[PDB]
Amino acid sequence: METLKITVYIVVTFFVLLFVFGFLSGDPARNPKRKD
Amino acid sequence: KLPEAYAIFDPLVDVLPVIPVLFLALAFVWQAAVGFR
Amino acid sequence: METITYVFIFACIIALFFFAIFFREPPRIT
Amino acid sequence: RGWFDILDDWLKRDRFVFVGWSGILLFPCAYLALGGWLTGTTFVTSWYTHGLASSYLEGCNFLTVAVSTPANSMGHSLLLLWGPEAQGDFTRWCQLGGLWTFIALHGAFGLIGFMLRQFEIARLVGVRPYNAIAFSAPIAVFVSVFLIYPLGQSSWFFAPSFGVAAIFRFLLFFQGFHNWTLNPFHMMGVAGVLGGALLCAIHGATVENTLFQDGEGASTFRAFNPTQAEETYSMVTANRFWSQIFGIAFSNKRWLHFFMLFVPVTGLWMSAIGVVGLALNLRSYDFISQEIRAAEDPEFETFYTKNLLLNEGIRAWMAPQDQPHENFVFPEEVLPRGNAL
Amino acid sequence: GGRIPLWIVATVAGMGVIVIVGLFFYGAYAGLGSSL
Amino acid sequence: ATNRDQESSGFAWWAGNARLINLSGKLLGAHVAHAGLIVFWAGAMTLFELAHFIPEKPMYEQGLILIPHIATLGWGVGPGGEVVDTFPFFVVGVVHLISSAVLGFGGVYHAIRGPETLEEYSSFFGYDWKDKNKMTTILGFHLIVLGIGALLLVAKAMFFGGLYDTWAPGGGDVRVITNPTLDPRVIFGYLLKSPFGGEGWIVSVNNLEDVVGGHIWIGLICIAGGIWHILTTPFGWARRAFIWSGEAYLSYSLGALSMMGFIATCFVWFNNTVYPSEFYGPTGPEASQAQAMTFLIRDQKLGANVGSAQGPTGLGKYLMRSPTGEIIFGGETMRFWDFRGPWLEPLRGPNGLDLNKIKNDIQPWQERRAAEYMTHAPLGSLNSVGGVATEINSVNFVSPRSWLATSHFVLAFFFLVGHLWHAGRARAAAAGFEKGIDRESEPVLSMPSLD
Amino acid sequence: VFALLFFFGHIWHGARTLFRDVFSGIDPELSPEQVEWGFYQKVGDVTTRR
Amino acid sequence: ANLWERFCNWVTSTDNRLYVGWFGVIMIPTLLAATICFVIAFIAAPPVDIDGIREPVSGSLLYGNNIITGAVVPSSNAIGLHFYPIWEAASLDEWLYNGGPYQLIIFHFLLGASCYMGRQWELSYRLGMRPWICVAYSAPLASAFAVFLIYPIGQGSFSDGMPLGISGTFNFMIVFQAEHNILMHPFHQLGVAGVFGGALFCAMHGSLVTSSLIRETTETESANYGYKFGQEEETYNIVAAHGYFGRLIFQYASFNNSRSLHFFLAAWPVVGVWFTALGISTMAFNLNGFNFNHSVIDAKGNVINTWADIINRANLGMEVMHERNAHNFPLDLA
Amino acid sequence: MTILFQLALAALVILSFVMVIGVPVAYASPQDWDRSKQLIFLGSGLWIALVLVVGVLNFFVV
Amino acid sequence: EVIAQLTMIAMIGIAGPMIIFLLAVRRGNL
Ligand code: CLA
Ligand code: CLA
Ligand code: CLA
Ligand code: CLA
Ligand SMILES: CC1=C(/C=C/C(C)=C/C=C/C(C)=C/C=C/C=C(C)/C=C/C=C(C)/C=C/C2=C(C)CCCC2(C)C)C(C)(C)CCC1
Ligand SMILES: CC1=C(/C=C/C(C)=C/C=C/C(C)=C/C=C/C=C(C)/C=C/C=C(C)/C=C/C2=C(C)CCCC2(C)C)C(C)(C)CCC1
Ligand SMILES: CC1=C(/C=C/C(C)=C/C=C/C(C)=C/C=C/C=C(C)/C=C/C=C(C)/C=C/C2=C(C)CCCC2(C)C)C(C)(C)CCC1
Ligand SMILES: CC1=C(/C=C/C(C)=C/C=C/C(C)=C/C=C/C=C(C)/C=C/C=C(C)/C=C/C2=C(C)CCCC2(C)C)C(C)(C)CCC1
Ligand code: OEX
Ligand SMILES: [Cl-]
Ligand SMILES: [Cl-]
Ligand SMILES: [Fe+2]
C-alpha cells in the first residue's frame, strides 16, 4: 500500500508542477492578437 | 436594551440597519433622474 | 445475459463517440 | 363587401393588442381562468371538499393558497353552475369546487385559442408556423395532467389543484403512489427539460462570446442592427471552440435551431404519454426480478428497495388527510416506521 | 400631457408597492396565518 | 460630461462604475463612501441587537451575530459567558456609527466635489494601474495596516483583558493569554494539516494560545511583506505571469475573498473555540453528539448498562468504536466522533470515552449542557421555525451558525463567479478582444482545419 | 395514447395544408413594411397602406 | 527551441483536434481515473455499507442490479468526512466494503470538472474569443459541487452525498425533501423557474428562428441545406420573427436585438441554476424551506390544515422510513 | 441633566438630518460653492462638538 | 409606537429622493 501511496504522490506532484510551470511560462503572450 | 437614557430613540435604532440598502435604491432614483445615460 | 446486454450497449455507445469525433464529416468552409 | 368581410377587417386591424378571430375564443377564456384563479385563491375555501383552508381570506399565503379540486363524491361532474349539484347557487358552487372545473375548462379553451392565435398571426405575417407546433407540447402536458389523468381515476379530486403547495403535494403523491421517478416516460421528459435548459444556456453563451466587434463600445449590445445582413457572431469560431472543447459542434445554424425546438417539445410529449398510463394506475412501479430476489434474500438491498420503503411511508402517513372521504383510520401501531423515528 | 417627470412617478409607484408588500409580510406574523 | 454617459465612457449605465477605472479621485470617493457603509452597518446593527437583547436569554435564541463577536474578545461577559455589563456593546456600536459619518463625508467629498483625478494634484496619491512600482507600494502600505491589526488582537489578548475561553477550567471565562505559541512547528503545522475529517486544516485550532501566537506570526509577516513591497518592484517571472491592470487586480482580490468566504463558512460551522457555543449555539456535530449523551444519561439512570447494550444493527446502542478504535457515541452520530468540546472532554480517556467516567462522573452541568445543545441543534426553516423540516410551528429559532454559514457561502460563491468574470475579461481586454472578434482578422480563419 | 399522438398529426398536417406556400421557407424578398407596425391598417393586407 | 518550450507549444496548441491546455494537463488524468473506476465499480463492485450499520447496499450490475437500480454507493457513515484513499485501507476488500470507490470517483471528478471549466476559458483566450462560456458552465459545475461536496460537508458525511446511480439519485431527492422541505425553498423554486423557463425559451427561440427561415430550398430537400457553414449572410428574417412574436404578445415584449436576445437565453437558466445550486449548498447548513405547519388556526385554536400540512404528512412518511435501522435516538439531526 | 442630554442628542440628530441633505446638495451646485462652503464648515464643527458633548453627558445620566 | 418607527423610516426614506429632487430643481450637477 506504501508503494501505491508513493507512486501517487509522485504522479500528482509531477502533474501539479506541469500545471504551475506551464502557466508561468509566459501564458499571457500565448494568444492570437497582442504578444504584450 | 439601550441604557434608559437612550430608550426614546429605540424606534430610530429599530430602523437604522435598513439604511445601507436605501443607498442602493437611491442610485436607481438617481439614474432614472438622469435618464440612464 | 442481462449484464452482458447492458455492457454491450454501453460499449457500442463509447465506440460511437470515437467515430463521431474522429470520423465526422469535416465541416468545410464552402 | 359583406358583413363577414368587414368584421374580418376589424378583427385583424393592427393595434397594440391584436385580436383576430382566435381572440373571440382566447380573451374571454384566458381572462376567466385567470380571474377565476385569482378570485378563488383570494376568497374561496376548500373546507367542504378537502378539509383545507386555501385562500388569503383564511390566512393562507401565496405558497399555500390554491383553487382546490372538488370533492371525490362529485365524480367527473362538469360542475356547471346551473347543473344539478349547485342548482344555480353561486355561493354553494364555490363551496363544492365549481371554480376548479371553471378554470380547468376555460383554461383548456384558452389554450386552444392561443394556439389558434399562433396559426392566425403566423398566416397573416407570412412565416412558417413552427411556434404553434411547438406549443403543442404545453397543450399535451395540460390535457394529460389536468383532464385525462383524473378521468381515469375516481374523480376530479385527484387532479392537481391550482396552487403552489398543492402542486408539490401532487409531486409527492406521484412518488409515493405511482413511483413516477422510475417511469421511463418521465425520465425522457426530464432529459428534454434539462436538455432544453442546457441548450438555452449554451447557445446564448456561445453567441454572446463569439460576437464580432461591430462597434467601439464596451457594451456590445448597441453594435447590432436588426436589418443588418451579416451574422452578428462567428459560426466558424464557435464551431472550432466546441469541436476542440467537446469533440463535436454544430455546423448548421438551421439544424441547431430546429434541434432547440425539438428537444424540449419532444420531452414534454413523452412525459404526457407516461401520465396517460398513470390515469390507469399503469405504473412503472416495480422490477419483478428484484422483488423475487428481495423476498427470498433478506440481505439483498438496493436503492430500488430503499425507495419503495419511502413510498410506503408516504402512502400510509399521508392518506388519511389527503383522501379524507376514505375515512382512513390508521392506529399508530400500523404506521410503518423504522427505529426511533 | 407629459409634465410630471417619469423618474418621479417611478419612485412614488415604487415606494407604493414596497408598502403594500411590506404589509403582507407584516401580516405573516399577525392575525390569521401567524400560527399564534 | 466627463465620462458619466455611455457615449464618452464606452460603458452603459448598468456597468456605470466601470466609468471610474481611470478617475482615481472619484474612485477614491466610491471606496471611502463604501467603507462608510460597512462601518455604518456594524454600528447600526450592534445598536439594534443591544435594543433587542435580553441578557436572561442565550445569545443564540436572539438572532445576534455581532454581539457574539464582541463577547468573544472578552468584553461584557463573565464566567460561563454570562453577560455582566452591556455598556461595552453600546460603545462598539456608537463608535462605528459616528465613525461612519466621517467616512461618508470624505467619500462624498471625493466622489462629487474633489478632483476627479488625483495625479495632477499629487504624485503620492495619484497612480497608474500599470505602474508596477506604485501598485506594490500601495499593496505594501495596506500590508502594514493589516499586520498592525492582527497585533491589536494580540494586544487585546495579552495586555488588555484577555479573551473569552470556552475551554477555561470551570465552564469558561475571560482569560489573559501569557504564553502564546510561537513554535512554527505548531503554527504552520496547522496549514499543512489535511482539510478532511479528523484534521480540519486551520479550522481545527482549539486553544487561544495557538490563536494568539498565529496572529503574532501574521502581524510580523504582513509588516515584513509590506516593507518588502514598498522597497521592491516585481521580478521578471512575475511580470510575465500576470496581467497588470485595474480589472485584473480586482479579479485577483475577488478570487482571494471568495477563498476566504468559504473558509469562514467552515470556521463558523465546525469551530467551537473562536465561535464559542455559549454565544453561537452548538455546532451541528455538537448537537448531534449531545443527543446521544442525553439518552445515554437518561437510560443509564433507569438501570441500563450502556456499554453492553447491543443495538438493532449489532453495533452498540450508545457506544461503538470508530474505524481506528476510539470509543465514540453510537447511532448516526458515529459520523461526528471528531467533535471536541468542554462539556464532553472530561469523559474522555486514552481510548476515547471512558466507561468508568460515564458510569461515575457525569455532572449535572453536563446533563444540562447536553440537553440545552440537543434542543438548539442548528436546524430550522427560512421563516425561523426551529427544528427539523417536519416540526410544527412554536419555537422561533434558527442558529446563528446556520445564518453565518449560509450567508457567507452564497457570497463566497458569487465572488468566485465575479473572479472568473473579471479575470477572463481582464485577460481579453489586455490582448484586445473583449469587445468582439475583428472581422478583417478572425484568428480562426488563419488556422488549419482540424480535420 | 394513440388519440393524443394523432392530435399532433392533426396539427402537423393541418399546418402544412394551410401554410403550403411557405413550407420551404418564407419569401426571400419579404418587405419590412408587411411585418413592422402601423404601416398597414390590416395585418398582412397591403391594400390598407397608411 | 528548447525541450520545455516545445512541450509548452504543444500543450497550448490550437491545432490539436482536442485542445489540451494547462487545465487539460490536470483534467485528463483525473477524468480518466474517475471514469475507469466508475465503470468497473458500476459493473462489478461488491456491496457497500453506506450507512455504517453493517448493512451493505448492492450497487453493481453483477450483484443483481440493472441500469436503473444500479449505482456506485456512497462511502460509509463510519468514515464521515475522513479521507479514505486506497492506501489507508488494509486491503482492497476493506476499501470496497466501506465505499472507497465513491471517494476516488467524486474527488477526481470534481477536480476534472473544475479544470474543464478553466479549459473552456483557456481555449477561448487562444482563439481570440470573449471569455464567459466558462461562467455559464459554472452553474452546472456548482450544482455538482453541491450534491457531492458541500451537502456532505454540512451534514458531516459523504454517506449523505448523492449516490452515483439513477435510483440512488431519487433516494437522495426524497430524503432531502423529508429533511429540508426543499420544495418549499425559494432557491429551488428558482431552479424550476430556471429550468422550465430555460426549456420554454429554448423551444421558443428554436421555433421562432425556424419559422422565419428564408426560402433557400425546394420542398424535396431538407431546409437545413439552405445554410452553408461559414456563410456571411443570415438564414432567417429576425425582422419577420419580431413581427410574428411582437403581435403574438405585444411589440415591446419582443426582442429585436439579437445580442440582447441571446444574452437573455444565457442568463435566465444560468442564474436559475445558480440559485438552486446555492439552495442545496445552504440547506447543507440546515437553513431549510418555509415551514407553515399548523400556521392557520381557528378562533378556538383548532389547526385548520392547508396544503403545507399535507406536504408535511408526506415528509413525515419519508422521514420515519428512510434509513430505517440507523437511528437510535428520536431526532434525525444530521 | 437628563433633559439637557436629550437636548444635545436631539440637536445632534436634527443636525445630522440637516447635513445628510445639505452637504450633498451644496456639493453639486456650483452656483453656491462659496455661499455654502462656510456652512459645511460651521455645520461640521457644530456636529463634532455635539458628539463630544453627548459623550461626556452620557457619563452623568447612563 | 410602531407609528414612531414608521415616521422615522418615512422621514429617513424621503431623504434620498429629496436630494435628487433639489439638485434637479436647482439645475445642479446630477
Ligand atoms: C495581500 C497579500 C499579498 C499580495 C497580493 C502579494 C503579491 C505579490 N507578491 Mg508578495 N508577499 C506578501 C503579501 C502579498 N504579496 C507578504 C505578506 C510577504 C511576506 C512573506 C510577501 C513576500 C513576497 C516575496 C518574497 C515576493 C513576493 C512577490 C509578489 C508578487 C508575485 C506573487 C505571486 O507569484 O503569487 C504567488 C504565486 C506563485 C506561483 C507562487 C507559488 C504558489 C504555490 C502554488 C502555492 C503554495 C506556496 C505558497 C507561496 C506558500 C505555502 C504555504 C504552505 C505552508 C501551505 C506579487 C506582486 C514576488 C515579487 O515579485 O517580489 C516583489 C516575490 O519574490 N511577495
Ligand atoms: C369564448 C367564450 C366562452 C367559452 C368557450 C366558454 C366556455 C364555457 N363556459 Mg364560460 N363564460 C364566458 C365565455 C365563454 N365560456 C363569459 C363571457 C362568461 C361571463 C358571462 C362566462 C361565464 C361562465 C360561467 C359562470 C360558467 C361558464 C361555463 C362554461 C362551460 C360550459 C358552457 C356551456 O355549457 O355552454 C352551453 C351553451 C352553449 C354551448 C352555447 C349555445 C350555442 C348555440 C347558439 C346553440 C344553438 C345552435 C343552433 C341550433 C344553430 C345556430 C346556427 C347559427 C348560424 C346561428 C364552458 C367551458 C360553466 C363552467 O365553466 O362550469 C364548470 C359555468 O358555470 N361560463
Ligand atoms: C456603494 C455604492 C456605490 C458608490 C459608492 C458609487 C459611486 C459613484 N458612482 Mg456608481 N453605481 C452604483 C453604486 C455605487 N456608485 C450602482 C448600484 C449603480 C447602478 C445604478 C451605479 C451606476 C453608476 C453610473 C451609471 C455612474 C456612476 C458614477 C459614480 C461616481 C460619480 C457619481 C456622481 O457623479 O454622482 C452624481 C449624483 C449626485 C450629485 C446625486 C447625489 C449623490 C450623493 C452621493 C447623495 C448621497 C447623500 C448621502 C446621504 C451623503 C450625506 C451624508 C454626509 C453628511 C456624511 C461615484 C464615484 C458615475 C461615474 O462613473 O462618473 C464618471 C456614473 O456615470 N455609478
Ligand atoms: C483611503 C483614505 C483616503 C485617502 C487615501 C485620501 C487621500 C486624500 N484626500 Mg481625503 N478624505 C478621507 C480619506 C482619504 N483621503 C476621509 C475619510 C475624509 C473625511 C474627513 C477625507 C476628506 C478629505 C478632504 C475634505 C480633503 C481630502 C483631501 C485628500 C488629498 C490630500 C489629503 C492629505 O494630504 O492630507 C494629509 C493628511 C495627513 C498628513 C495625515 C492626517 C490625516 C489623518 C488625521 C491621519 C489619520 C491616520 C489614521 C490612524 C488612519 C486610520 C484611521 C482608521 C481607518 C483606523 C488626498 C488625495 C484634500 C484634497 O484633495 O483637496 C483638494 C481635501 O481637501 N480628503
Ligand atoms: C371567476 C368568476 C368570474 C370572473 C371573475 C373575474 C374576471 C375575476 C378577475 C379578477 C382579477 C383580474 C383579479 C386580479 C387580482 C390581482 C392581484 C391579486 C395582484 C396582486 C399582485 C401582486 C401582489 C404582485 C406584486 C409584486 C410582487 C410580488 C413582486 C414584484 C412587484 C410586484 C408589484 C409585481 C365571473 C364574474 C364570470 C363569475 C363566475 C366566477
Ligand atoms: C457616492 C454615491 C453614492 C454612495 C453614497 C455613499 C455610500 C454615502 C455614504 C454615506 C454615509 C456612510 C453616511 C453616514 C452617515 C452617518 C451619520 C449621519 C451618523 C450619525 C449618528 C448619530 C447622529 C448618532 C446618534 C445616536 C447616538 C449617538 C446614540 C444612540 C442614538 C443615536 C443613534 C440617535 C450613491 C450610490 C448614493 C450614488 C452615486 C454617488
Ligand atoms: C492566524 C492564525 C493562524 C495562522 C495563520 C497562518 C500562519 C496563515 C498562513 C497563510 C499562508 C502562508 C497562506 C498562503 C497563501 C497562498 C496562496 C493562496 C497562493 C496562491 C497562489 C496563486 C493564486 C498562484 C496562481 C498562479 C499559478 C499557480 C501559476 C502562474 C499564474 C498564477 C500566478 C495565476 C493559525 C492557523 C495558526 C491559528 C489561528 C489564527
Ligand atoms: C445614522 C443617522 C442618520 C442618517 C441617516 C441617513 C444617512 C439616511 C439616508 C437615507 C437614504 C439614503 C435614503 C434613500 C432613499 C431611497 C429611496 C426611497 C429610493 C427608492 C427607489 C425606488 C422606489 C425605485 C424606483 C425605480 C426607479 C427609480 C427606476 C427603475 C424602476 C424602479 C421601479 C426600480 C440620521 C440623519 C437619520 C440621524 C440618526 C442617525
Ligand atoms: O444517512 Mn443518509 O440521512 Ca441525513 O439525516 Mn440523519 O442522516 Mn442519515 O438519517 Mn436522515
Ligand atoms: Cl433511505
Ligand atoms: Cl441515532
Ligand atoms: Fe440563435
Q: Which domains does chain F carry?
A: 4-281+378-451 (no CATH), 282-377 (1.10.10.670)
**Amino acid sitting at position F265:** T
SS3 F376: coil
Alpha helices in I1-62 (DSSP H): 2-28, 33-57
* Cβ–Cβ under 8 Å, residues D273 and G4: yes
Using a CB-CB cut-off of 8 Å, the residues of chain E touching F393 are 35
Structure determined via: X-ray
Determine the length of chain H: 334
Distance in Å, alpha carbon of J27 to nearest chain B alpha carbon:
12
How many other CB atoms are found less than 10 A from the CB of residue F17?
Answer: 12
HSE-CB of D244 using CA atoms within 13 angstroms: 28
Residue F91 burial class via C-beta count within 10 angstroms: exposed 0-12, middle 13-18, buried 19 and up: middle
F162/G29 Cα distance (integer angstroms)? 84
Distances (CA, A) of D136 to D52, D122, D146, H193: 34, 15, 15, 20
Gyration radius from chain E CA atoms: 16
> Cell 405558497 appears where?
D63
Specify the DSSP element, H or E, that contains D162: strand D162-163
Nearest CA-CA partner of H141 in H100, H113, H164, H107: H113
Q: In this complex, which of C22, C24, C26 lies closest to F449 when CB atoms are compared?
A: C26
Domain count, chain E: 1
**Residue H158 φ then ψ, to 5°:** -65, -20
Q: In this complex, which of F98, F101, F112 lies closest to I28 when CB atoms are compared?
A: F112
* Cβ–Cβ under 8 Å, residues F26 and F110: yes
* Cβ–Cβ under 8 Å, residues F245 and F130: yes
H245/H238 Cα distance (integer angstroms)? 10
Q: Sign (positive/negative) of CA torsion G6, G7, G8, G10?
A: positive
- Nearest chain A residue (CA) to H24: A19
SS3 A4: helix
HSE-CB of F232 using CA atoms within 13 angstroms: 11
F104 contacts: CB under 8 Å, gap ≥ 6 = F33, F36, F40
| Nearest CA owner, ligand 4 atom 50 | F145
Q: How many CB pairs under 8 A join E and F?
A: 3
C-beta atoms of G35 and H239 within 8 A: yes
**C-alpha grid cell for residue F118?**
488625483
Distances (CA, A) of F47 to B10, B14, F397, J10: 9, 9, 21, 20
Query: Pairing between strand F327-329 and F348-349?
Result: unpaired
Nearest CA-CA partner of A12 in H95, H87, H96, H153: H87
**Residue J16 φ then ψ, to 5°:** -70, -55
The answer, yes or no, to whether any atom of ligand 6 lies below 6 A from the CB of F54, is no
Query: Pairing between strand D162-163 and F173-175?
Result: unpaired
β-sheet bridge partners, residue F165: F173
Distances (CA, A) of D31 to D34, D56, D106: 5, 21, 9
| Boundaries of domain holding E29 | 1-36
The answer, yes or no, to whether any atom of ligand 2 lies below 6 A from the CB of D106, is yes
The answer, yes or no, to whether any atom of ligand 2 lies below 6 A from the CB of D22, is no
D231/D227 Cα distance (integer angstroms)? 11
* Cβ–Cβ under 8 Å, residues D180 and D160: no
CATH number of the domain bearing residue E24: 6.10.250.2070
**Amino acid sitting at position E25:** F
Q: How many CB pairs under 8 A join F and I?
A: 15
**C-alpha grid cell for residue F359?**
458510569
Domain boundaries, chain D: 23-341
* Cβ–Cβ under 8 Å, residues F432 and A33: yes
**Amino acid sitting at position D200:** C
Alpha helices in chain D (DSSP H): 3-11, 22-43, 47-50, 90-96, 98-125, 130-134, 136-143, 149-152, 164-173, 184-208, 235-246, 253-279, 288-296, 303-322
- Nearest chain A residue (CA) to H29: A15
β-sheet bridge partners, residue F385: F396
| Nearest CA owner, ligand 9 atom 6 | H334
CA of H95 to the centre of ligand 9 (A): 22
* Cβ–Cβ under 8 Å, residues J15 and I17: yes
SS3 H305: coil
G14/F442 Cα distance (integer angstroms)? 46
**Amino acid sitting at position H271:** V
CATH number of the domain bearing residue I31: 1.10.287.740
Task: Give the mutation candidate from F194, F240, F242 for the A interface (greatest A CB count, under 10 A).
Answer: F240
* Cβ–Cβ under 8 Å, residues F157 and F212: yes
Q: Sign (positive/negative) of CA torsion D233, D235, D240, D242?
A: positive
Enumerate neighbours of H (3 or more CB pairs within 8 A): A, C, D, E, F, G
* Cβ–Cβ under 8 Å, residues H334 and F388: no
β-sheet bridge partners, residue H297: H303
Specify the DSSP element, H or E, that contains G2: helix G2-18
The answer, yes or no, to whether any atom of ligand 9 lies below 6 A from the CB of H51, is yes
* Cβ–Cβ under 8 Å, residues F275 and F311: no
F201/H248 Cα distance (integer angstroms)? 59
**Amino acid sitting at position D203:** H
* Cβ–Cβ under 8 Å, residues H30 and H115: yes
* Cβ–Cβ under 8 Å, residues D189 and D268: yes
G12 contacts: CB under 8 Å, gap ≥ 6 = D133
* Cβ–Cβ under 8 Å, residues D273 and D189: no
Distances (CA, A) of F294 to F298, F357, F372: 6, 15, 10
Resolution to one decimal, Å: 2.3
Alpha helices in chain H (DSSP H): 3-11, 21-44, 92-97, 100-126, 133-145, 151-155, 166-180, 186-211, 238-248, 258-283, 307-321
Q: Degrees (nearest 5) of the Cα angle H266, D200, F417?
A: 35
Interface present between H and C (3 or more CB pairs within 8 Å): yes
What's D145's DSSP letter? I
B27/J19 Cα distance (integer angstroms)? 12
How many other CB atoms are found less than 10 A from the CB of residue D290?
Answer: 19
> Cell 427505529 appears where?
D339
D10/D18 Cα distance (integer angstroms)? 10
| Nearest CA owner, ligand 9 atom 7 | H334
What does the DSSP assignment read for F316-340?
A: BSSEEE-TTS-EEE-SGGGGGTT--
Using a CB-CB cut-off of 8 Å, the residues of chain E touching H296 are 32-33
Nearest CA-CA partner of F203 in F131, F121, F263, F115: F263
C-beta atoms of E28 and F383 within 8 A: yes
How many other CB atoms are found less than 10 A from the CB of residue F326?
Answer: 16
F53/F48 Cα distance (integer angstroms)? 9
SS3 E2: coil
* Cβ–Cβ under 8 Å, residues D328 and D319: yes
Please check whether residue D65 touches E, CB under 8 A.
no
Q: In this complex, which of H214, H239, H242 lies closest to G28 when CB atoms are compared?
A: H214
First to last CA, chain C: 49
CA of F156 to the centre of ligand 3 (A): 38
Alpha helices in D162-302 (DSSP H): 164-173, 184-208, 235-246, 253-279, 288-296
The answer, yes or no, to whether any atom of ligand 3 lies below 6 A from the CB of B36, is no
Q: Degrees (nearest 5) of the Cα angle D215, D218, D220?
A: 55
C25 contacts: CB under 8 Å, gap ≥ 6 = none
Distances (CA, A) of F359 to D19, F302, F363: 84, 12, 11
H159/H75 Cα distance (integer angstroms)? 5
β-sheet bridge partners, residue F349: F352
**Amino acid sitting at position F207:** N
CA of A27 to the centre of ligand 5 (A): 58
What does the DSSP assignment read for F301-320?
A: HHT--TTT-B-TTSSBSSEE
**Residue F118 φ then ψ, to 5°:** -85, -15
H198/D201 Cα distance (integer angstroms)? 7
What's F199's DSSP letter? T
**Amino acid sitting at position H1:** A
**Residue D66 φ then ψ, to 5°:** -155, 150
| Boundaries of domain holding I18 | 1-62
CA of F27 to the centre of ligand 4 (A): 14
**C-alpha grid cell for residue H12?**
497550448
**C-alpha grid cell for residue B3?**
441604557
D92 contacts: CB under 8 Å, gap ≥ 6 = D86
H56/I54 Cα distance (integer angstroms)? 71
H324/D312 Cα distance (integer angstroms)? 12
CB burial of D157-188 (b: ≥16 within 10 Å; e: otherwise) equals bbbbbbbbbbebbbbbbbbbbbbbbbbebbbb
F249/F243 Cα distance (integer angstroms)? 8
F124 contacts: CB under 8 Å, gap ≥ 6 = none
The answer, yes or no, to whether any atom of ligand 9 lies below 6 A from the CB of F332, is yes
Distances (CA, A) of F50 to F44, F76, G2, H253: 10, 12, 69, 49
What's F57's DSSP letter? S
Which of H322, H327, H328 most suits a substitution to test ligand 9, by most atoms within 8 Å of the C-beta? H322
SS3 D250: coil
CA of D38 to the centre of ligand 5 (A): 5
Q: In this complex, which of A19, A31, A32 lies closest to H22 when CB atoms are compared?
A: A19
HSE-CB of D51 using CA atoms within 13 angstroms: 14
